[PDB]
């Protein structure tokens, strides 16, 4: 079976660093497009960062760009994000999502709600 | 018996064959589009709805998707046929939704011949909200962005013109890139008051059927 | 607060398919192998049929 | 004997092999169905048909004479000829409609006139064929000869409308689909920054056109029996070298009909 | 609280996979590998079906194996002769986008559906000689994606909200109603006895249901991505699945684990449809790549190619008597194979 198991979350003070790390076990992790989403507490899900098969395409949103860094080791099957001058409005759940379907560069169905391929969550607090 | 059997099957093919001709007649002259994205009001201009509007005597086809989930990457695969896809944007985080969703579409392998016409609503509600008191936090790339040479301003902000060229770049960044001659994008600037958007609809179909005859003949 | 009553579901689906009868790889196997075996004849498709018995023909 | 007939019907088989396999190509596929098609089939059959005969021009001009057997080959030639050249007009004529009423041509109104266009081609391409057949001879040499057979009134009547009168239209309607080209390759470089195709194209068909074709028209309006015959054959080539490289441009680089 | 919920879930989950690894004492390879090979097979194309004008996206055939229904979204069915070549019907349609169509046994009717989320039944053998809409199903709340006839008055049909229903065409209400999916429901298959079918959804998922009692048995898991297309072995006592990964599955009901794979290394594209044949050793699965492939059902080993479409395939069926197999693509064409 799939399945996405994440952890590293915690309580951490006004410009702190976190490092969030996520392990995948039931499918090759070189063939798909890895992603990381997160929920406000009264919001939607909202969209953060991507990554490719190969780590040559990294994308961001715009409220994170200098603060996240994105990674992925493909010998050990893990995807990590790691996290640094962190503010306020950014407590939230975050999840690790999976493209649907591999060898493919577009991306559907990820930030909706009823999502198969995504992982419990874990918690972070600032 | 076998005799009158055969003949009796091929009076009736013959009479499908005639209607089945005049339908091929009908069909094969009117134009699809699809709306997905402020889309009612361009509409005013169940599973699913269908409008049917004629201009200049030519016969047009809108489809507005409703009761559908949001997981719509099963269902988006029959819309491949249509002459083009229409998409509605606020443009005033709903744009980084917005640019995904367009990057998704763009990109998918069975719509990489169609089409994407592309209305940038609610300009009126940019001017105020640019002039009443902030887009550098979403988007930090807005402090080294001019508003180019090539542009069109309207009488009546310089502040209003910036932003708006900033989100139409944006979009075209997307269709720039990774896309080889077989589609392409029509961005234009609209608000609810707006009554040309049929004609702006007509000029880019007629645009697109010209593009792709040109691009058979290796013209272009 | 669905959470519960979704996780309570869950809980007895998986309580209900826990306890099913099984048997070995192996039987399945023979029985599949049997079954392919015993109708091997009457397949147009991997015996070729001759053109006189072919609608298609 | 001489080399003459030589090069010209190893021109001719160069021309009657491709052709062949193109119209093989086409008439057995069911899908291709469409106007253009239609009219590249056209111009292959012309082709075709010209190949055939210049084959004959010395499969029954050496090896047999009996003093006969040319009128009809000759006759056949020229309808060929007509057949081609009216062919590349129409082309031009289909693709100008198709880029002006982009969005009222679709199995509409092209079949009731393509077919109007091919009926009177070939129309006038075989009354212009079977008249040296009989009547305007100049068998009877009251000094009104031309090339071999024709006299100076069918050449001439063939020769101001053969290319001249067409070569015109041509040109008018190229400028026409030009102008269309240049505005959408502006509009697209101007997206691009946030035409060397398609000029390409139109100066090699134009100018190979031309070039192919002038020769034969201006030493025709012009040259009299009294003139050497070793000039007819050297202006005469180039349109035999027309004739092998026109079907490589639209019925070969095309994708839909390669693939097949 | 949800924490000892899940504990337990998952020490449920520990306890399922245990006592499926307790029965797991050889593989089917080698049990099989004395048995000497199909061969190759080479099956040319027959006839050519034409006359519809857009993609076709469904196909059934009929129980007296001469009769066939296509469906595209030009917004027409068709039902032909496959023996003459020769058209019997064209059923024009509300609605342009279809998704499905369906064969009653007997013969007597014929269902549609697709995006308007609604099941029209047409009557055939009317006495005004015309066909009609003899009653909309309505209730469900996405798009419809297969339907299939039970007998002359029930059907099951399988949507997009994750949900299956059954009906009672006469009256015109749901008798039962099947839940547990999470994504959206693509291909059913009917058992032979029609005492049992499976779903195939997006979500690496199919589950096995009871019509009478209307509740899930046996959930089978082990695909990487959504599956598409799910067939019944005729023994009763298997089925294979085709998915996103390039990859076919056979499953067996009695030990409740995957049996064979099938897969290779030039293939990267999707699976449409799947199919297998009379005795059950050869599978058809057709592929996104124009292409249609047959497989050995106990071997693993490719056998042949079925080449000729312009475009994807998106239906096939095997005749009741094997005696052919139709395949219709994206590009308005059926080709039966022999």
Redesign the interface.
Known sequence: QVQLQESGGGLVQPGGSLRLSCAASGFTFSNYKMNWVRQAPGKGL??VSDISQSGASISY???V?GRFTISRDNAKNTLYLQMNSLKPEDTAVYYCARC?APF??????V?????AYRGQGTQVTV | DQRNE?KA??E??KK??K??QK???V???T?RLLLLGGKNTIVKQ???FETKFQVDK?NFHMFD?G??????????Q?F??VTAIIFVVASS?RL??AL?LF??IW???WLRDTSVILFLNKQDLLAEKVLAGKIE????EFARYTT?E?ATPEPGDPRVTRAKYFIR?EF??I??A?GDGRH??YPHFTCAVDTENIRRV?ND???I???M??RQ???? | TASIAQARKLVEQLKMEANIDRIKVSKAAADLMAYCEAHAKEDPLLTPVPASENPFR | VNPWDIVLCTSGTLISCENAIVVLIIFHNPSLRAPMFLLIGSLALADLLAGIGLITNFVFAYLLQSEATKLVTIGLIVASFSASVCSLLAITVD?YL??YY???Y???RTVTFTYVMLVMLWGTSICLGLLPVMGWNCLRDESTCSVVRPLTKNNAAILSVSFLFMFALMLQLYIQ?CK??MR??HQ?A?????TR??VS??AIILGTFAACWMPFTLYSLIADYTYPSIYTYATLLPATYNSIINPVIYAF?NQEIQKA | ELDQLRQEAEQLKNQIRDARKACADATLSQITNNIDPVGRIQMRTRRTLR?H???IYAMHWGTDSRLLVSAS????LIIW?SY?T?????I?LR?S?VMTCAYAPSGNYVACG?????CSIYNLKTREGNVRVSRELAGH???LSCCRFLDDNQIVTSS??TTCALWDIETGQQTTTFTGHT??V?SLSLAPDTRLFVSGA?DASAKLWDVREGMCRQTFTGHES?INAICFFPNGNAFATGSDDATCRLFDLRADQELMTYSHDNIICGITSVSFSKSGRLLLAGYDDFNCNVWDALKADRAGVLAGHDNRVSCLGVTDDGMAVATGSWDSFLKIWN
């Open positions: 909202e969209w949103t715009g409220s760009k649907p493919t560069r577009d991306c559907f169905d930030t909706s709600t009823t999502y | 055969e099957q091929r009736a093919n499908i064959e209607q089945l339908d091929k007649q069909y094969r002259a134009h169940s599973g699913i030519v998707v009761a559908q989930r949001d997981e719509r990457r099963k269902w988006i029959c491949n046929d985080n980084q939704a995904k990057d998704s990109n998918n392998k936090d979403y988007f930090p180019p090539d770049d075209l960044r269709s720039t990774s392409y994008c007509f179909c007629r645009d059927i010209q593009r005859h040109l003949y290796e013209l272009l | 693709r198709s880029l982009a969005l009222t679709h199995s509409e689909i269309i080209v959408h390759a697209i101007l997206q691009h920054h946030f195709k398609g194209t139109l680089r | 006359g004008l857009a993609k979204q030009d917004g027409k002769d003459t020769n058209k019997v019907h064209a024009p609605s986008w697709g995006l308007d989320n609604i709340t996405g798009y997009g909200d994504g959206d693509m997006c959504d």
